[PDB]
Structures are given as C-alpha cells and as structure tokens.
Amino acid sequence: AIGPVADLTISNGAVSPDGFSRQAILVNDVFPSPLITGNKGDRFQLNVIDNMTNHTMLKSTSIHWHGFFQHGTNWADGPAFVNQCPISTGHAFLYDFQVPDQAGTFWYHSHLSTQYCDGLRGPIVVYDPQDPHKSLYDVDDDSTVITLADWYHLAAKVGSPVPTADATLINGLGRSIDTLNADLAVITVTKGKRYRFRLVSLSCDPNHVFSIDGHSLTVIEADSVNLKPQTVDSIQIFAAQRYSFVLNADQDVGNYWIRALPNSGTRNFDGGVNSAILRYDGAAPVEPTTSQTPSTNPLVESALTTLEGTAAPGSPAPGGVDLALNMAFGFAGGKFTINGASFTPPTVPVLLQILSGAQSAQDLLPSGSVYSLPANADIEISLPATAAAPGFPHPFHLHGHTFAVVRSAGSSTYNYENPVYRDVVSTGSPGDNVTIRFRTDNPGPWFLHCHIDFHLEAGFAVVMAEDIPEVAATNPVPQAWSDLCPTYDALSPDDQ
Ligand SMILES: *[C@@H]1O[C@H](CO)[C@@H](O[C@@H]2O[C@H](CO)[C@@H](O)[C@H](O)[C@H]2NC(C)=O)[C@H](O)[C@H]1NC(C)=O
Ligand SMILES: [Cu+2]
Numbered sequence: 001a002i003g004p005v006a007d008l009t010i011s012n013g014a015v016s017p018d019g020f021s022r023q024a025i026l027v028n029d030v031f032p033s034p035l036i037t038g039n040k041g042d043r044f045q046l047n048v049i050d051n052m053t054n055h056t057m058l059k060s061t062s063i064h065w066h067g068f069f070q071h072g073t074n075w076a077d078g079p080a081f082v083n084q085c086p087i088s089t090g091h092a093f094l095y096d097f098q099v100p101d102q103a104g105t106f107w108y109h110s111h112l113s114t115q116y117c118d119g120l121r122g123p124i125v126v127y128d129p130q131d132p133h134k135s136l137y138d139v140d141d142d143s144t145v146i147t148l149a150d151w152y153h154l155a156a157k158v159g160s161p162v163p164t165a166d167a168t169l170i171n172g173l174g175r176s177i178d179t180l181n182a183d184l185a186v187i188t189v190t191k192g193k194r195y196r197f198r199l200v201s202l203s204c205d206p207n208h209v210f211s212i213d214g215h216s217l218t219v220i221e222a223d224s225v226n227l228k229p230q231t232v233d234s235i236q237i238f239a240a241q242r243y244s245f246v247l248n249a250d251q252d253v254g255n256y257w258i259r260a261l262p263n264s265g266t267r268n269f270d271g272g273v274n275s276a277i278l279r280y281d282g283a284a285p286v287e288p289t290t291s292q293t294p295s296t297n298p299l300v301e302s303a304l305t306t307l308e309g310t311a312a313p314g315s316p317a318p319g320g321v322d323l324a325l326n327m328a329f330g331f332a333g334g335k336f337t338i339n340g341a342s343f344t345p346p347t348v349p350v351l352l353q354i355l356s357g358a359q360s361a362q363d364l365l366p367s368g369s370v371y372s373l374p375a376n377a378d379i380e381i382s383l384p385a386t387a388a389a390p391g392f393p394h395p396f397h398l399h400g401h402t403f404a405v406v407r408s409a410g411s412s413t414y415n416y417e418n419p420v421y422r423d424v425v426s427t428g429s430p431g432d433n434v435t436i437r438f439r440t441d442n443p444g445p446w447f448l449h450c451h452i453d454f455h456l457e458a459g460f461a462v463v464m465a466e467d468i469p470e471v472a473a474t475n476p477v478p479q480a481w482s483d484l485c486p487t488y489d490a491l492s493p494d495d496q
C-alpha cells in the first residue's frame with residue numbers, strides 16, 4: 001500500500017472490471033483505486049495531481065477522506081463547494097492532515113458531483129499498533145481489505161440520472177449478466193489461521209447483503225469505531241459503511257462463495273454474479289460449488305455497542321440535548337428536499353463564505369440548506385423515513401463527526417446507555433425514526449447528506465455550520481487552498 005505521504009495522480013483511462021470496457025477514472029494509473037495506509041497518529045500528506053481530460057466525467061476533482069474528523073483542517077475535507085472549489089485540471093493540491101485519536105477502516109472518493117461513481121474511490125486503513133481486537137487474529141494486511149462496488153456500463157452523466165448497476169465489484173472484479181465469463185476476485189486464506197477482514201462499501205447506490213458460504217463473521221468495527229465483538233452470519237452493509245470482521249479459516253480446505261447481494265439491479269447469483277471466492281491454500285483452482293443457507297444471525301445494528309460502551313451525549317430522554325433538529329425528507333421537482341429546501345452547490349464554497357465574513361445560517365448560501373450549530377453542545381438529529389423521498393432506505397452521512405445511533409432502522413427502542421457509534425447510518429423505511437446524537441467539538445461547515453450519490457446530485461443534503469465564530473481561527477487555510485477558487489472560476493465551462 002501507499003501513504004501516509006504520497007502522490008495521487010488522477011487520470012482518465014479504459015477499464016474493464018466486469019469484463020466489459022469503458023472510459024473511467026484512474027488513480028496512480030490503476031483501477032480500482034489503490035489502498036492508502038497509515039498508523040494511529042500519522043500526518044497524511046496526499047498530493048492530488050489532477051490530469052483528467054474528459055469533461056463528461058469532469059476534468060476537475062475534489063477528494064474526501066470519508067471518516068476522518070479533520071479537526072482544524074476543515075479545508076481539506078473535500079466536498080466540492082462546501083469545503084473547497086474543485087482542484088483544476090493540470091494543477092496539484094496537497095491535502096495535509098492528521099489523524100490523532102482515530103484508527104480503523106476508512107475510504108476516499110471524489111466528492112464532486114457524482115464522479116466517485118466513475119471510479120475515483122478507494123479504501124484507507126489506519127492501523128492501531130495497540131488494537132484492542134488485535135489478539136483475535138493473525139493477518140491484517142493489504143490482502144485483507146475487501147471492497148464492494150456497484151458498476152455501470154454507462155458513465156454517471158451518460159446513462160440515467162438514477163441508473164442500475166450492471167455488476168457488483170468485489171476487490172475490483174465481478175460479473176455482469178452479459179459477462180458470465182469475467183474474472184472473479186480471489187481471497188486467499190490458510191487453514192487454521194485467523195484473519196481481520198476490512199469490508200468497505202465503495203458504492204454509489206445499492207446496499208449489499210454480504211456473507212461467506214460456510215463461515216461466520218465476528219464483527220469488531222463499524223465505520224472506524226471499535227465494537228464489542230458480535231458474531232454474525234450476514235451483514236447488510238450500506239453505501240459508504242465499513243465493517244471489520246474476524247474470520248477463522250477452520251473449515252474444510254476448499255472454495256467457498258463470497259456473496260454481496262445488491263438491493264437493486266441483478267438480484268440472486270446466477271453464473272457467479274455478485275460473487276467472489278474464498279480459497280483455502282491447497283484447494284483446487286476452481287470456482288466454488290457451495291450453497292448459501294438462509295441462516296439466521298444477521299448483523300442487527302440496534303444490537304451493536306462501542307467496545308468502550310460510551311453513552312449518547314445528552315440526557316437519556318427524547319430531546320435531552322441542547323439542540324434537537326428534525327430533518328423532514330421530501331421530493332419536489334425531480335429534486336430531493338430536506339425541510340423544504342433542496343441543496344444546490346453555491347458558487348462560493350460554504351467555508352469560504354464563512355471565511356469571507358458570513359456570520360450565520362441565514363447569510364450562508366444555499367438558503368434553507370445551512371443549519372447553525374453552537375459550540376460545545378449535545379445535538380440530536382432525527383431523520384424519519386418516508387416514501388416521500390424515493391429510493392429509501394437512504395444512508396445518511398455526517399462529515400466531521402462520529403455520532404451515536406440512538407435509534408436504528410427497524411427498531412423502536414432508543415438506547416442512550418451504550419449505542420453503536422458510526423458515521424454512515426441507514427435511515428430505514430416507513431415508520432422508522434433513525435435518531436442520532438453528537439457533540440459540537442469541531443468548528444467548520446460539515447456536509448450531512450444521503451450517500452446515494454445520485455440522491456446527493458439531486459439535492460439531498462444540508463450543511464451543519466458548526467460553531468461559525470471559531471471557524472476562521474480553528475482552520476487556518478494554506479496558500480494553495482486559497483488559490484483553488486480563483487483558478488477554478490477562471491475555467492471555461494467545458495474544462496470543468
Ligand atoms: C469520456 O467519457 C465518457 C464516459 O466515460 C465516454 O462516453 C462514451 O462515448 C460513447 C458516445 O460517444 C458511448 O457510445 C459510450 O457508452 C460512452 N462510454 C461511457 C462509459 O458511457 C467517452 O468516449 C469519453 N471521451 C474520450 C474521447 O474517451
Ligand atoms: Cu464523509
């Protein structure tokens with residue numbers, strides 16, 4: 001792997017991850033994007049060199065490090081027009097940040113329009129040399145990162161505004177129904193060894209039920225939060241989520257199917273679609289012939305807790321916080337709506353507006369999309385599921401924070417005692433009332449949006465304008481960030 005200090009060169013090229021080929025987005029010349037690593041505490045310096053020439057997939061770029069708090073470096077967060085102007089083609093831009101206090105499974109992806117779907121997305125791992133789950137396994141390396149990704153034969157701006165994947169990719173590889181021949185990913189295990197697998201959903205849209213024939217999975221991490229271990233059978237993982245699970249390779253030397261059933265496009269697994277291969281050392285070089293059992297024991301979010309059993313911020317009762325907010329989902333034009341307002345990217349990034357002297361949610365553009373948050377306060381946000389917003393279950397994501405999930409989709413219980421904490425949550429479906437809490441530690445504007453990229457493009461986002469008065473003092477910006485906008489605004493519309 002690469003990093004924490006590395007060049008990330010972005011370019012256009014042809015790729016063929018399901019055996020069909022198309023023009024996509026390459027990172028340091030490879031698809032899928034390379035794994036980046038570091039250790040708890042490291043300074044990351046990722047110098048992102050944009051050499052893209054293809055306007056249809058967007059010449060400009062901007063990169064988000066999904067999961068990292070970025071305290072003091074809000075400018076390096078990534079979302080285009082919230083946290084920077086995009087990097088311009090033929091230019092470089094250095095994201096220089098630290099991760100004290102975090103370690104786990106993370107990923108990076110374009111945060112400009114819907115460009116991550118065209119291929120600028122990869123996993124990050126920050127190891128803890130003192131990992132409390134460490135003695136549960138033998139292997140934890142580049143080979144144990146397992147990515148899921150939806151793949152489309154038409155590019156995001158060429159096909160439907162809300163399309164359907166032709167393939168699912170597992171470690172970059174998988175099959176579409178027209179390509180029952182295409183290569184399969186192979187994950188290699190030695191019998192009697194214990195493995196930490198790090199599961200990252202690189203998905204622009206579908207969730208996936210993930211499961212490995214013949215095996216059970218001991219989940220120990222959610223979106224970079226250490227968990228009390230929780231044994232399961234199958235994991236329904238939503239776009240942008242991550243889980244670490246320990247697998248003990250203690251079954252008959254053989255080939256077993258690894259399955260990621262999407263919630264749309266090609267359901268079930270005929271011909272090894274939505275599939276990859278677990279292969280014990282010494283097993284024949286052949287496709288698995290195993291069967292899934294319906295099996296029980298799925299991951300249930302309301303049953304997970306943090307390894308440390310941390311309480312929700314606030315007091316144990318609905319509204320027991322400094323500010324309680326309710327996000328009412330809706331869909332007016334062909335556009336998603338939160339409390340009546342649809343996110344359109346402002347000309348001047350939200351952070352620059354604040355830095356240029358805007359003082360309140362009311363001065364911030366776009367009007368109706370920005371929420372002012374006070375400093376050092378317990379905040380509660382409820383996001384009641386509704387079919388009024390099509391393409392639910394919507395996985396909502398809060399930048400700059402991990403939050404307690406006080407009420408998970410599919411449950412009615414509220415847990416203030418020891419909830420799971422994570423950064424991406426399924427807002428479930430009619431009658432759910434997913435409710436989340438966090439503390440306002442971290443000054444700056446933080447995107448809070450649906451992680452279905454096509455929903456984001458159609459305006460399904462708000463901005464948590466956190467502790468506005470301390471943003472400028474807390475996030476001094478580097479010269480290069482200040483120059484992003486003047487450079488980007490000078491471009492012709494088809495060099496964008
Ligand atoms: C740059 O980007 C896009 C998408 O990656 C390319 O669009 C393709 O072009 C033709 C139309 O001319 C189609 O028949 C395809 O289906 C497109 N592929 C994509 C994946 O949808 C395009 O060719 C690119 N331009 C440069 C010249 O390669
Ligand atoms: Cu994020």
Ligand SMILES: [Cu+2]
Nearest residue numbers: 064066240397
């Ligand atoms: Cu993200």
Ligand SMILES: [Cu+2]
Nearest residue numbers: 394450452455
């Ligand atoms: Cu959505």
Ligand SMILES: [Cu+2]
Nearest residue numbers: 064397399447
């Ligand atoms: Cu995001």
